[PDB]
Amino acid sequence: SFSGYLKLTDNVYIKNADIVEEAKKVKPTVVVNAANVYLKHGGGVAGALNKATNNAMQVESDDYIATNGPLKVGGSCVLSGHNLAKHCLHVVGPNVNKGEDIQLLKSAYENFNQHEVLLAPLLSAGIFGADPIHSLRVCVDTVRTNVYLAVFDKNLYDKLVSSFL
Ligand SMILES: NC(=O)c1c[nH]c(C2CC2)n1
Ligand SMILES: [Cl-]
């Protein structure tokens, strides 16, 4: 199963790891993608996960959007996990850089509660522009299911662990 994770709370775990490599190794039931409303997996975690699927995630996502329209900020959809996981839970955290509402981060993390265990990134962190310390706090205070957070950046991982209340 998941290895080398530091236990933050009863249900939240964290590791300095590339979520793509964690997914290829563990093959979890659910890998969370840091999606946007259009499921356009260009960069950040989404670009990395999509590149690992050889663009199959993007092809599937475009068909999903053609049928259903865009997701809501704070919303999610379950699609295939391709070669990475059984499922991919595409969750849209607010992108502060695109001027979206940071109050929607709690709604975004609530999607994780529909799955007993997930491999996930820190929502709205990185190129989404939110404070990762705040994202981890919202995660621990919102998610009740077992979440294994893979934080790519070593310096951020150390900062998150050392400042965790
Ligand atoms: N942006 C990220 O959080 C992230 C995680 N994994 C990767 C892969 C190296 C491309 N990027
Ligand atoms: Cl990012």
JSON list of C-alpha atoms and ligand atoms in Angstrom, two decimals:
[
{"chain": "A", "resi": 1, "resn": "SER", "atom": "CA", "xyz": [0.00, 0.00, 0.00]},
{"chain": "A", "resi": 2, "resn": "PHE", "atom": "CA", "xyz": [1.15, 3.66, 0.71]},
{"chain": "A", "resi": 3, "resn": "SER", "atom": "CA", "xyz": [4.62, 3.85, 2.18]},
{"chain": "A", "resi": 4, "resn": "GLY", "atom": "CA", "xyz": [6.75, 6.50, 3.83]},
{"chain": "A", "resi": 5, "resn": "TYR", "atom": "CA", "xyz": [3.91, 8.82, 4.73]},
{"chain": "A", "resi": 6, "resn": "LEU", "atom": "CA", "xyz": [4.04, 11.01, 7.85]},
{"chain": "A", "resi": 7, "resn": "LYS", "atom": "CA", "xyz": [0.75, 10.79, 9.83]},
{"chain": "A", "resi": 8, "resn": "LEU", "atom": "CA", "xyz": [-0.64, 14.32, 10.43]},
{"chain": "A", "resi": 9, "resn": "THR", "atom": "CA", "xyz": [-4.03, 13.37, 11.95]},
{"chain": "A", "resi": 10, "resn": "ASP", "atom": "CA", "xyz": [-6.23, 10.26, 12.39]},
{"chain": "A", "resi": 11, "resn": "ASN", "atom": "CA", "xyz": [-6.97, 10.33, 8.63]},
{"chain": "A", "resi": 12, "resn": "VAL", "atom": "CA", "xyz": [-4.52, 12.68, 6.86]},
{"chain": "A", "resi": 13, "resn": "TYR", "atom": "CA", "xyz": [-1.10, 11.49, 5.74]},
{"chain": "A", "resi": 14, "resn": "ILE", "atom": "CA", "xyz": [1.64, 13.40, 3.88]},
{"chain": "A", "resi": 15, "resn": "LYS", "atom": "CA", "xyz": [4.75, 12.55, 1.83]},
{"chain": "A", "resi": 16, "resn": "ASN", "atom": "CA", "xyz": [7.27, 14.47, -0.28]},
{"chain": "A", "resi": 17, "resn": "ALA", "atom": "CA", "xyz": [6.61, 12.65, -3.54]},
{"chain": "A", "resi": 18, "resn": "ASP", "atom": "CA", "xyz": [5.53, 13.11, -7.09]},
{"chain": "A", "resi": 19, "resn": "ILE", "atom": "CA", "xyz": [1.87, 12.10, -7.19]},
{"chain": "A", "resi": 20, "resn": "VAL", "atom": "CA", "xyz": [2.44, 10.58, -10.68]},
{"chain": "A", "resi": 21, "resn": "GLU", "atom": "CA", "xyz": [5.10, 8.23, -9.29]},
{"chain": "A", "resi": 22, "resn": "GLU", "atom": "CA", "xyz": [3.01, 7.47, -6.19]},
{"chain": "A", "resi": 23, "resn": "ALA", "atom": "CA", "xyz": [0.09, 6.60, -8.50]},
{"chain": "A", "resi": 24, "resn": "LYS", "atom": "CA", "xyz": [2.19, 4.37, -10.80]},
{"chain": "A", "resi": 25, "resn": "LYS", "atom": "CA", "xyz": [3.59, 2.54, -7.75]},
{"chain": "A", "resi": 26, "resn": "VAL", "atom": "CA", "xyz": [0.51, 2.12, -5.55]},
{"chain": "A", "resi": 27, "resn": "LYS", "atom": "CA", "xyz": [-2.23, 2.03, -8.24]},
{"chain": "A", "resi": 28, "resn": "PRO", "atom": "CA", "xyz": [-4.70, 3.48, -5.68]},
{"chain": "A", "resi": 29, "resn": "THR", "atom": "CA", "xyz": [-8.46, 3.15, -6.01]},
{"chain": "A", "resi": 30, "resn": "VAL", "atom": "CA", "xyz": [-8.63, 6.94, -6.39]},
{"chain": "A", "resi": 31, "resn": "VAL", "atom": "CA", "xyz": [-6.08, 9.49, -7.47]},
{"chain": "A", "resi": 32, "resn": "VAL", "atom": "CA", "xyz": [-7.23, 13.12, -7.17]},
{"chain": "A", "resi": 33, "resn": "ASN", "atom": "CA", "xyz": [-6.47, 15.51, -9.96]},
{"chain": "A", "resi": 34, "resn": "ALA", "atom": "CA", "xyz": [-6.12, 19.27, -9.36]},
{"chain": "A", "resi": 35, "resn": "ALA", "atom": "CA", "xyz": [-8.54, 20.02, -12.19]},
{"chain": "A", "resi": 36, "resn": "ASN", "atom": "CA", "xyz": [-9.99, 23.22, -13.67]},
{"chain": "A", "resi": 37, "resn": "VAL", "atom": "CA", "xyz": [-13.69, 23.53, -14.68]},
{"chain": "A", "resi": 38, "resn": "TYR", "atom": "CA", "xyz": [-12.88, 22.73, -18.30]},
{"chain": "A", "resi": 39, "resn": "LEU", "atom": "CA", "xyz": [-10.80, 19.62, -17.49]},
{"chain": "A", "resi": 40, "resn": "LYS", "atom": "CA", "xyz": [-8.00, 21.19, -19.57]},
{"chain": "A", "resi": 41, "resn": "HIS", "atom": "CA", "xyz": [-4.99, 19.39, -18.07]},
{"chain": "A", "resi": 42, "resn": "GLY", "atom": "CA", "xyz": [-2.28, 21.78, -19.22]},
{"chain": "A", "resi": 43, "resn": "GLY", "atom": "CA", "xyz": [0.08, 22.18, -16.32]},
{"chain": "A", "resi": 44, "resn": "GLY", "atom": "CA", "xyz": [0.62, 21.63, -12.60]},
{"chain": "A", "resi": 45, "resn": "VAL", "atom": "CA", "xyz": [-0.62, 18.30, -11.24]},
{"chain": "A", "resi": 46, "resn": "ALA", "atom": "CA", "xyz": [-3.21, 18.02, -14.08]},
{"chain": "A", "resi": 47, "resn": "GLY", "atom": "CA", "xyz": [-0.59, 18.37, -16.82]},
{"chain": "A", "resi": 48, "resn": "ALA", "atom": "CA", "xyz": [1.64, 15.85, -15.06]},
{"chain": "A", "resi": 49, "resn": "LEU", "atom": "CA", "xyz": [-1.12, 13.26, -14.52]},
{"chain": "A", "resi": 50, "resn": "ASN", "atom": "CA", "xyz": [-2.40, 13.69, -18.07]},
{"chain": "A", "resi": 51, "resn": "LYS", "atom": "CA", "xyz": [1.12, 13.33, -19.57]},
{"chain": "A", "resi": 52, "resn": "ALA", "atom": "CA", "xyz": [1.54, 10.07, -17.56]},
{"chain": "A", "resi": 53, "resn": "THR", "atom": "CA", "xyz": [-1.66, 8.72, -19.24]},
{"chain": "A", "resi": 54, "resn": "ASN", "atom": "CA", "xyz": [-0.21, 9.56, -22.72]},
{"chain": "A", "resi": 55, "resn": "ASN", "atom": "CA", "xyz": [-3.07, 12.14, -23.08]},
{"chain": "A", "resi": 56, "resn": "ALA", "atom": "CA", "xyz": [-5.82, 9.49, -22.57]},
{"chain": "A", "resi": 57, "resn": "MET", "atom": "CA", "xyz": [-7.02, 11.53, -19.56]},
{"chain": "A", "resi": 58, "resn": "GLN", "atom": "CA", "xyz": [-7.46, 14.62, -21.78]},
{"chain": "A", "resi": 59, "resn": "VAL", "atom": "CA", "xyz": [-9.30, 12.64, -24.52]},
{"chain": "A", "resi": 60, "resn": "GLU", "atom": "CA", "xyz": [-11.67, 11.18, -21.94]},
{"chain": "A", "resi": 61, "resn": "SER", "atom": "CA", "xyz": [-12.08, 14.62, -20.28]},
{"chain": "A", "resi": 62, "resn": "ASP", "atom": "CA", "xyz": [-12.95, 16.36, -23.56]},
{"chain": "A", "resi": 63, "resn": "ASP", "atom": "CA", "xyz": [-15.70, 13.80, -24.20]},
{"chain": "A", "resi": 64, "resn": "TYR", "atom": "CA", "xyz": [-16.94, 14.33, -20.60]},
{"chain": "A", "resi": 65, "resn": "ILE", "atom": "CA", "xyz": [-17.06, 18.15, -21.12]},
{"chain": "A", "resi": 66, "resn": "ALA", "atom": "CA", "xyz": [-18.73, 17.81, -24.56]},
{"chain": "A", "resi": 67, "resn": "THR", "atom": "CA", "xyz": [-21.53, 15.80, -22.89]},
{"chain": "A", "resi": 68, "resn": "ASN", "atom": "CA", "xyz": [-21.83, 17.50, -19.50]},
{"chain": "A", "resi": 69, "resn": "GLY", "atom": "CA", "xyz": [-20.41, 21.00, -19.74]},
{"chain": "A", "resi": 70, "resn": "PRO", "atom": "CA", "xyz": [-17.91, 22.44, -17.29]},
{"chain": "A", "resi": 71, "resn": "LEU", "atom": "CA", "xyz": [-17.61, 21.52, -13.64]},
{"chain": "A", "resi": 72, "resn": "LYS", "atom": "CA", "xyz": [-18.27, 24.11, -10.91]},
{"chain": "A", "resi": 73, "resn": "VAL", "atom": "CA", "xyz": [-15.36, 25.59, -8.91]},
{"chain": "A", "resi": 74, "resn": "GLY", "atom": "CA", "xyz": [-15.50, 23.44, -5.75]},
{"chain": "A", "resi": 75, "resn": "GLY", "atom": "CA", "xyz": [-16.99, 20.53, -7.70]},
{"chain": "A", "resi": 76, "resn": "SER", "atom": "CA", "xyz": [-15.75, 17.24, -9.01]},
{"chain": "A", "resi": 77, "resn": "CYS", "atom": "CA", "xyz": [-16.31, 14.35, -11.31]},
{"chain": "A", "resi": 78, "resn": "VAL", "atom": "CA", "xyz": [-15.12, 10.74, -11.28]},
{"chain": "A", "resi": 79, "resn": "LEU", "atom": "CA", "xyz": [-13.44, 9.55, -14.45]},
{"chain": "A", "resi": 80, "resn": "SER", "atom": "CA", "xyz": [-11.02, 6.68, -15.27]},
{"chain": "A", "resi": 81, "resn": "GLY", "atom": "CA", "xyz": [-7.71, 6.53, -13.48]},
{"chain": "A", "resi": 82, "resn": "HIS", "atom": "CA", "xyz": [-6.15, 5.10, -16.71]},
{"chain": "A", "resi": 83, "resn": "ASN", "atom": "CA", "xyz": [-2.71, 3.52, -15.97]},
{"chain": "A", "resi": 84, "resn": "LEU", "atom": "CA", "xyz": [-2.44, 5.43, -12.67]},
{"chain": "A", "resi": 85, "resn": "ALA", "atom": "CA", "xyz": [-5.41, 4.42, -10.53]},
{"chain": "A", "resi": 86, "resn": "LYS", "atom": "CA", "xyz": [-8.85, 2.70, -10.76]},
{"chain": "A", "resi": 87, "resn": "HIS", "atom": "CA", "xyz": [-10.48, 6.18, -10.82]},
{"chain": "A", "resi": 88, "resn": "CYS", "atom": "CA", "xyz": [-9.44, 9.76, -11.07]},
{"chain": "A", "resi": 89, "resn": "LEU", "atom": "CA", "xyz": [-11.44, 12.19, -8.96]},
{"chain": "A", "resi": 90, "resn": "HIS", "atom": "CA", "xyz": [-11.08, 15.51, -10.79]},
{"chain": "A", "resi": 91, "resn": "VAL", "atom": "CA", "xyz": [-11.55, 18.16, -8.14]},
{"chain": "A", "resi": 92, "resn": "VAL", "atom": "CA", "xyz": [-11.69, 21.88, -8.90]},
{"chain": "A", "resi": 93, "resn": "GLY", "atom": "CA", "xyz": [-10.14, 23.98, -6.18]},
{"chain": "A", "resi": 94, "resn": "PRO", "atom": "CA", "xyz": [-10.38, 27.79, -6.58]},
{"chain": "A", "resi": 95, "resn": "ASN", "atom": "CA", "xyz": [-7.54, 29.23, -8.67]},
{"chain": "A", "resi": 96, "resn": "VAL", "atom": "CA", "xyz": [-6.59, 32.43, -6.86]},
{"chain": "A", "resi": 97, "resn": "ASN", "atom": "CA", "xyz": [-4.39, 33.44, -9.89]},
{"chain": "A", "resi": 98, "resn": "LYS", "atom": "CA", "xyz": [-7.46, 33.42, -12.13]},
{"chain": "A", "resi": 99, "resn": "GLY", "atom": "CA", "xyz": [-9.21, 35.53, -9.39]},
{"chain": "A", "resi": 100, "resn": "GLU", "atom": "CA", "xyz": [-11.43, 32.70, -8.10]},
{"chain": "A", "resi": 101, "resn": "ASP", "atom": "CA", "xyz": [-12.90, 32.64, -4.57]},
{"chain": "A", "resi": 102, "resn": "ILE", "atom": "CA", "xyz": [-10.56, 31.01, -1.94]},
{"chain": "A", "resi": 103, "resn": "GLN", "atom": "CA", "xyz": [-13.66, 30.34, 0.29]},
{"chain": "A", "resi": 104, "resn": "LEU", "atom": "CA", "xyz": [-14.53, 27.49, -2.21]},
{"chain": "A", "resi": 105, "resn": "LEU", "atom": "CA", "xyz": [-11.54, 25.40, -1.05]},
{"chain": "A", "resi": 106, "resn": "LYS", "atom": "CA", "xyz": [-13.57, 23.74, 1.72]},
{"chain": "A", "resi": 107, "resn": "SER", "atom": "CA", "xyz": [-16.28, 22.74, -0.83]},
{"chain": "A", "resi": 108, "resn": "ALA", "atom": "CA", "xyz": [-13.53, 21.33, -3.06]},
{"chain": "A", "resi": 109, "resn": "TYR", "atom": "CA", "xyz": [-12.13, 19.16, -0.22]},
{"chain": "A", "resi": 110, "resn": "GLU", "atom": "CA", "xyz": [-15.67, 17.93, 0.65]},
{"chain": "A", "resi": 111, "resn": "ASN", "atom": "CA", "xyz": [-15.57, 15.90, -2.57]},
{"chain": "A", "resi": 112, "resn": "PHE", "atom": "CA", "xyz": [-12.88, 13.69, -0.97]},
{"chain": "A", "resi": 113, "resn": "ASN", "atom": "CA", "xyz": [-15.44, 12.50, 1.64]},
{"chain": "A", "resi": 114, "resn": "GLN", "atom": "CA", "xyz": [-17.21, 10.44, -1.03]},
{"chain": "A", "resi": 115, "resn": "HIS", "atom": "CA", "xyz": [-14.16, 8.09, -1.24]},
{"chain": "A", "resi": 116, "resn": "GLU", "atom": "CA", "xyz": [-12.81, 5.90, 1.62]},
{"chain": "A", "resi": 117, "resn": "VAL", "atom": "CA", "xyz": [-9.18, 6.37, 0.59]},
{"chain": "A", "resi": 118, "resn": "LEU", "atom": "CA", "xyz": [-7.49, 8.73, -1.86]},
{"chain": "A", "resi": 119, "resn": "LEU", "atom": "CA", "xyz": [-4.04, 9.67, -3.14]},
{"chain": "A", "resi": 120, "resn": "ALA", "atom": "CA", "xyz": [-4.21, 13.47, -3.56]},
{"chain": "A", "resi": 121, "resn": "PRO", "atom": "CA", "xyz": [-2.37, 16.70, -4.12]},
{"chain": "A", "resi": 122, "resn": "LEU", "atom": "CA", "xyz": [-2.82, 19.80, -1.94]},
{"chain": "A", "resi": 123, "resn": "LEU", "atom": "CA", "xyz": [-5.85, 21.58, -3.53]},
{"chain": "A", "resi": 124, "resn": "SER", "atom": "CA", "xyz": [-5.41, 25.13, -4.86]},
{"chain": "A", "resi": 125, "resn": "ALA", "atom": "CA", "xyz": [-1.64, 24.91, -4.11]},
{"chain": "A", "resi": 126, "resn": "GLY", "atom": "CA", "xyz": [1.14, 25.49, -6.67]},
{"chain": "A", "resi": 127, "resn": "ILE", "atom": "CA", "xyz": [0.00, 27.26, -9.84]},
{"chain": "A", "resi": 128, "resn": "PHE", "atom": "CA", "xyz": [-3.54, 27.61, -8.38]},
{"chain": "A", "resi": 129, "resn": "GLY", "atom": "CA", "xyz": [-2.06, 30.35, -6.15]},
{"chain": "A", "resi": 130, "resn": "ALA", "atom": "CA", "xyz": [-3.44, 29.59, -2.71]},
{"chain": "A", "resi": 131, "resn": "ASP", "atom": "CA", "xyz": [-1.33, 29.43, 0.47]},
{"chain": "A", "resi": 132, "resn": "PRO", "atom": "CA", "xyz": [-0.41, 25.70, 0.80]},
{"chain": "A", "resi": 133, "resn": "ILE", "atom": "CA", "xyz": [-0.36, 25.99, 4.62]},
{"chain": "A", "resi": 134, "resn": "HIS", "atom": "CA", "xyz": [-4.01, 27.15, 4.45]},
{"chain": "A", "resi": 135, "resn": "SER", "atom": "CA", "xyz": [-4.83, 24.31, 2.00]},
{"chain": "A", "resi": 136, "resn": "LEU", "atom": "CA", "xyz": [-3.41, 21.66, 4.36]},
{"chain": "A", "resi": 137, "resn": "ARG", "atom": "CA", "xyz": [-5.38, 23.20, 7.26]},
{"chain": "A", "resi": 138, "resn": "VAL", "atom": "CA", "xyz": [-8.64, 23.11, 5.23]},
{"chain": "A", "resi": 139, "resn": "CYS", "atom": "CA", "xyz": [-7.84, 19.52, 4.19]},
{"chain": "A", "resi": 140, "resn": "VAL", "atom": "CA", "xyz": [-7.35, 18.29, 7.78]},
{"chain": "A", "resi": 141, "resn": "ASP", "atom": "CA", "xyz": [-10.46, 20.20, 8.98]},
{"chain": "A", "resi": 142, "resn": "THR", "atom": "CA", "xyz": [-12.71, 19.02, 6.08]},
{"chain": "A", "resi": 143, "resn": "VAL", "atom": "CA", "xyz": [-11.68, 15.57, 4.89]},
{"chain": "A", "resi": 144, "resn": "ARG", "atom": "CA", "xyz": [-12.84, 12.71, 7.15]},
{"chain": "A", "resi": 145, "resn": "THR", "atom": "CA", "xyz": [-11.81, 9.85, 4.82]},
{"chain": "A", "resi": 146, "resn": "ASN", "atom": "CA", "xyz": [-8.19, 8.57, 4.49]},
{"chain": "A", "resi": 147, "resn": "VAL", "atom": "CA", "xyz": [-6.19, 11.03, 2.37]},
{"chain": "A", "resi": 148, "resn": "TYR", "atom": "CA", "xyz": [-2.56, 10.47, 1.34]},
{"chain": "A", "resi": 149, "resn": "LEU", "atom": "CA", "xyz": [-1.15, 13.80, 0.28]},
{"chain": "A", "resi": 150, "resn": "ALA", "atom": "CA", "xyz": [1.76, 13.72, -2.15]},
{"chain": "A", "resi": 151, "resn": "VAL", "atom": "CA", "xyz": [3.59, 17.13, -2.06]},
{"chain": "A", "resi": 152, "resn": "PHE", "atom": "CA", "xyz": [6.00, 17.35, -4.97]},
{"chain": "A", "resi": 153, "resn": "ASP", "atom": "CA", "xyz": [8.11, 20.27, -3.74]},
{"chain": "A", "resi": 154, "resn": "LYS", "atom": "CA", "xyz": [10.62, 19.12, -0.99]},
{"chain": "A", "resi": 155, "resn": "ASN", "atom": "CA", "xyz": [11.00, 22.62, 0.47]},
{"chain": "A", "resi": 156, "resn": "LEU", "atom": "CA", "xyz": [7.23, 23.05, 0.65]},
{"chain": "A", "resi": 157, "resn": "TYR", "atom": "CA", "xyz": [6.83, 19.57, 2.19]},
{"chain": "A", "resi": 158, "resn": "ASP", "atom": "CA", "xyz": [9.36, 20.49, 4.94]},
{"chain": "A", "resi": 159, "resn": "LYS", "atom": "CA", "xyz": [7.62, 23.83, 5.50]},
{"chain": "A", "resi": 160, "resn": "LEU", "atom": "CA", "xyz": [4.16, 22.14, 5.70]},
{"chain": "A", "resi": 161, "resn": "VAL", "atom": "CA", "xyz": [5.31, 19.49, 8.21]},
{"chain": "A", "resi": 162, "resn": "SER", "atom": "CA", "xyz": [7.33, 21.92, 10.36]},
{"chain": "A", "resi": 163, "resn": "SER", "atom": "CA", "xyz": [4.47, 24.46, 10.57]},
{"chain": "A", "resi": 164, "resn": "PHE", "atom": "CA", "xyz": [1.59, 21.94, 11.03]},
{"chain": "A", "resi": 165, "resn": "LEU", "atom": "CA", "xyz": [-0.57, 22.68, 14.07]},
{"chain": "B", "resi": 1, "resn": "LIG", "atom": "N1", "xyz": [2.83, 20.43, -9.72]},
{"chain": "B", "resi": 1, "resn": "LIG", "atom": "C1", "xyz": [2.83, 19.39, -8.90]},
{"chain": "B", "resi": 1, "resn": "LIG", "atom": "O1", "xyz": [2.35, 19.43, -7.76]},
{"chain": "B", "resi": 1, "resn": "LIG", "atom": "C2", "xyz": [3.36, 18.11, -9.44]},
{"chain": "B", "resi": 1, "resn": "LIG", "atom": "C3", "xyz": [3.29, 16.87, -8.88]},
{"chain": "B", "resi": 1, "resn": "LIG", "atom": "N2", "xyz": [3.92, 16.00, -9.71]},
{"chain": "B", "resi": 1, "resn": "LIG", "atom": "C4", "xyz": [4.35, 16.74, -10.75]},
{"chain": "B", "resi": 1, "resn": "LIG", "atom": "C5", "xyz": [5.13, 16.07, -11.83]},
{"chain": "B", "resi": 1, "resn": "LIG", "atom": "C6", "xyz": [6.55, 16.48, -12.08]},
{"chain": "B", "resi": 1, "resn": "LIG", "atom": "C7", "xyz": [5.51, 16.83, -13.06]},
{"chain": "B", "resi": 1, "resn": "LIG", "atom": "N3", "xyz": [4.04, 18.03, -10.66]},
{"chain": "B", "resi": 2, "resn": "CL", "atom": "CL", "xyz": [1.21, 23.22, -9.40]}
]
